[PDB]
Amino acid sequence: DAAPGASKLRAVLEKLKLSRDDISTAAGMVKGVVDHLLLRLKCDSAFRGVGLLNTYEHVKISAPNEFDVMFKLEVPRIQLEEYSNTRAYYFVKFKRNPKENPLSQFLEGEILSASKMLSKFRKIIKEEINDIKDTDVIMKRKRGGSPAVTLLISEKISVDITLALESKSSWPASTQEGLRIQNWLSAKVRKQLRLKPFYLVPKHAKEGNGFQEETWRLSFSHIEKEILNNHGKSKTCCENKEEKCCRKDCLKLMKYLLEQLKERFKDKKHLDKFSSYHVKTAFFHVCTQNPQDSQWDRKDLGLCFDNCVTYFLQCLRTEKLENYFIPEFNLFSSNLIDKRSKEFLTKQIEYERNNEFPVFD
């Protein structure tokens, strides 16, 4: 056997730069909308602590016309109630607060109502994006049950807003054995990433007969950006020109190839169910599998891309993609994501692997 050509993969990287050449106008449109919306959320007394977390997070790099903009919110200390031993769905209870911050004034009972938060958040967005002059931002709609809130900025700039709570507390107990960068980077980098705050985004437990629960699953985007900017065992990896690796290269290759397959086979009703956060977590486990910068060299670009393909097919066959932070949470369960979709994606990736990848042109 032989890996696909690294020169061809660098041509794919040139095509990826050509894909992200169109930042400068969409970034200006979303910066104007972010400025106006963040300076009008602050007019509301029930959201006087909101903010934009600084991570512009292209989860969908193959089509930059859809945005997923995350907002942070500095909350008080929170007692967490785990839902149904699912190990990732928690209930938010503001543990004790004498200052009486307005989220607690908004809350229902003791569990923070996620549906009420997203309802009044969509109402404030509805009230304020029509106030934007010479930038037509209108309220679109999505269904299924995901908390994305679609806003279309005047020419194909579809922004799906997801507000995230930011607790500066300690990490929950199910996040203990995760973050396994101890023998890979250091225990010190692990512990300093432990000192950073964690995040909370909603999804009701979609397991068959769980419906509209006020559960909260953990987000990890900022730690993932920080480990993508510091990813080598040698700390100047992809910083000086002797330690150029292919981790960022193979990661963009896997995410671009998967999302172009999901773009191509969208006429079948099976490849909308996945995302590249799953591929990113599996890639971090490949980084655990391939620790050395000598085992991420430019001559190992096709080899590490092959190792990422084989581990993603391992996650498809063995049905186990643990979160890198929660070892007790498989993201590839058979009820959140249908199994025939997994077989279909497995069939397409096995088809593309063994025929020298005719998608690369």
Partner 1 sequence: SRKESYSIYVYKVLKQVHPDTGISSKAMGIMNSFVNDIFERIAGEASRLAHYNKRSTITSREIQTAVRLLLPGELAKHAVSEGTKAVTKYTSA
Partner 2 sequence: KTRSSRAGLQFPVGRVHRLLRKGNYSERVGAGAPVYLAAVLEYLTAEILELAGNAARDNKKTRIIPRHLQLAIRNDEELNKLLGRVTIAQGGVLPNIQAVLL
Partner DNA sequence: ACAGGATGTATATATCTGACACGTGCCTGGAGACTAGGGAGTAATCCCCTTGGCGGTTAAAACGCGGGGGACAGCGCGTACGTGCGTTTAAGCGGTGCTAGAGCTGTCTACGACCAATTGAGCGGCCTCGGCACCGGGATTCTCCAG
Partner DNA sequence: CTGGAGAATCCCGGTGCCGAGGCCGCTCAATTGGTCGTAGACAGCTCTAGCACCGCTTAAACGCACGTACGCGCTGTCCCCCGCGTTTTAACCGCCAAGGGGATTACTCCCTAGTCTCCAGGCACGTGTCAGATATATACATCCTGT
Tell me which residue of 240, 163, 229 sits closest to 202, measured CA to CA. 163
Choice from 42, 191, 264, 339 touching DNA (CB under 7 A) = 191
Shortest distance (Å) from residue 65 CB to partner 2: 38
Shortest distance (Å) from residue 188 CB to DNA: 5
Nearer to DNA, 191 or 317 (CB): 191
Euclidean distance between the first and final Cα of the chain, in Å? Answer: 21
Query: Has 237 been labeled as part of a binding site?
Result: yes
96 binds partner 1 (CB under 8 A): yes
Measured CA to CA, the distance from residue 165 to residue 122 in angstroms comes to 16
194 binds partner 1 (CB under 8 A): yes
Shortest distance (Å) from residue 324 CB to partner 1: 18
Measured CA to CA, the distance from residue 264 to residue 245 in angstroms comes to 29
Query: Has 301 been labeled as part of a binding site?
Result: no
Are the beta carbons of 112 and 120 closer than 8 angstroms? no
271-287: b (≥16 Cβ within 10 Å) or e? beebbbbbbbbbbbbbb
191 binds partner 1 (CB under 8 A): yes
DSSP designation for 212: S
Q: Which does 168 bind (CB under 5 to 8 A by kind): partner 2, partner 1, DNA, none?
A: partner 2
User: CB within 8 A of 22, min separation 6: which ones?
Assistant: 64
| Residues numbered 159-178 forming contacts with partner 2, rule: CB under 8 A | 168-170
- Secondary structure of residue 179 in the 3-state scheme: coil
Nearer to DNA, 235 or 264 (CB): 235
For the chain, list the strands marked E by DSSP: 50-52, 66-67, 70-73, 78-82, 90-94, 137-139, 149-153, 158-163, 165-167, 198-202, 216-219
Residue type for 124, please?
I
Q: Which does 188 bind (CB under 5 to 8 A by kind): partner 1, partner 2, DNA, none?
A: DNA
358 binds partner 2 (CB under 8 A): no
Query: Has 222 been labeled as part of a binding site?
Result: yes
Binding residues for ATP: 66-68, 221-224, 255, 276-280
Binding residues for Mg(2+): 66, 68, 160
Task: Please give the residue ranges that form the binding site for DNA (CB under 7 A).
Answer: 187-188, 191, 235
Task: Please give the residue ranges that form the binding site for partner 2 (CB under 8 A).
Answer: 77, 95-96, 98-99, 168-170, 191-192, 195, 197
